[PDB]
# Entry
Amino acid sequence: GGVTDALSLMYSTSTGGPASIAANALTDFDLSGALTVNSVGTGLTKSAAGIQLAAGKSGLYQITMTVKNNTVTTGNYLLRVKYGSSDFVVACPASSLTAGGTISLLIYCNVLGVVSLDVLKFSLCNDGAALSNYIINITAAKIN
Amino acid sequence: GGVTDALSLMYSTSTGGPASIAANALTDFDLSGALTVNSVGTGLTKSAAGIQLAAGKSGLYQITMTVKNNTVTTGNYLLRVKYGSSDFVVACPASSLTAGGTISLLIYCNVLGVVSLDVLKFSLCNDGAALSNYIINITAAKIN
Amino acid sequence: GGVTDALSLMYSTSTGGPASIAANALTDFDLSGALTVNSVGTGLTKSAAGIQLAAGKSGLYQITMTVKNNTVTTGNYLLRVKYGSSDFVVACPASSLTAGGTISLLIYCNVLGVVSLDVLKFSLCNDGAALSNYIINITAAKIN
# Structure
């Protein structure tokens, strides 16, 4: 029967992202100006903090964030997703064939009802170069 | 209630894969001869191009591709999944304990109704050696 | 409508994990003493072997295991998930910004009805240092 809530975004320098994502650092992304590719329900909404979870929406969430920045083919792409006190990370070695990275997660999210706390945060970068030619996709879906 | 469509494949030199996957290159996999491990519905079907999405099947898709080739324990395993104009990648450092790699994604797929365009494409390799001893699994499920 | 079965665990030295996870080796985790963060249904239960699948529960499973051990920022974090004869792996380069790793999978699980065979096994480590300051999360959900 599908899922009750979901949000899929496209993030780039033209769609709400920083003109240049600094090298070797992780600053959470303001997602208010991201392009909404698909939306289901009203429990997940973009904001300057990341992706907000509406009250009463505790449960299991499937999350994916990917990045391609074909001009940066060296170093490692660092990706991070946070929720409350938990944070999840991964490092993806860059190459000409894999100019970017991916992080996917199935996590349990407890919603306290404090908008500034109930938010999925996202960030990524390359540890050796700035990114100003990226296509980033962020999708989250409540599967239970 | 489960999902409406899903396909899980097992790909090897004995089940439709190349006798030898060339090193440091990414050629999309012909999946017509892959072993169907599990199948749900009729929206996702294997083909020479990858995994076809039937008309009217736009939505959210959960995808995973993994590989084990225990004889190749050096370099990085490069994995890639494509759909339309988007492509997702990841690099996984090889070791004797981790002789392979993994890429998982939750992406939104828009189905235009052009079989040759509406297809999930898959490819992987090792950046320093050819693979001729691999077990590859590819699973895709429409979750919304 | 959500999922029929799911289990989300929090594993640490205080919640059932080894006082010290040996370097460069993969020993499956005894999950009997892990903290149950969320539980759905009765098909997935923790045990000394990993996460048990109840009889009649064959199907598609979404799995994620993550680790953070902020004091170990070098080498690669090696993660592995096994089920029956299949095993899936990934390596995640460590850094101060990414002190850990992630592995996510959508796999098909055939349940034979042999408790000691129908179990998801988990293990991870750092290839250059022991881990005694970790927060590990393991979540599995039957999506079909």
